[PDB]
Amino acid sequence: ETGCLNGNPPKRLLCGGFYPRLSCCNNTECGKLLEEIKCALCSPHSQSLFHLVLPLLCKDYCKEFFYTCRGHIPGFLQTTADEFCFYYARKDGGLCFPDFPR
């Protein structure tokens, strides 16, 4: 199931706080969330995470991201969390971002 957005699968050993052993590679709370989402490219399931360009978000994390970054991101005041997560969160509850413990 693992796969990088590159051609080759991940390599076991820089986003090391999220994917230390194997990978593909503001002071606000929204900034920390933007760091986490930034490190989604280095995920071993990044090819499956990417099927605003964001990985398939978990529902709870999608609500948390929307409410935490609303007002800092253009257009988040122009939509509800239900529609935003309807477009960006994964529905089946399977493999979603974040795919690391938190």
Swiss-Prot record:
Domain of life: Eukaryota
Positions bearing carbohydrate: N26
Tissue specificity annotation: Widely expressed in fetal and adult tissues. Highest expression in adult heart, liver and pancreas, and in fetal kidney.
Protein localization: Cell membrane; Secreted
TM region positions: none
Protein family according to the UniProt entry: Belongs to the HHIP family.
Quaternary structure and partners: Interacts with all three hedgehog family members, SHH, IHH and DHH.
Biological role stated in the UniProt entry: Modulates hedgehog signaling in several cell types including brain and lung through direct interaction with members of the hedgehog family.
Domains: entry comment: A flexible loop interacts with the SHH zinc binding site and contributes to zinc binding.
Name recorded for this polypeptide: Hedgehog-interacting protein
Gene: HHIP
Full-sequence portion shown in this chain: 39 to 185 of 700
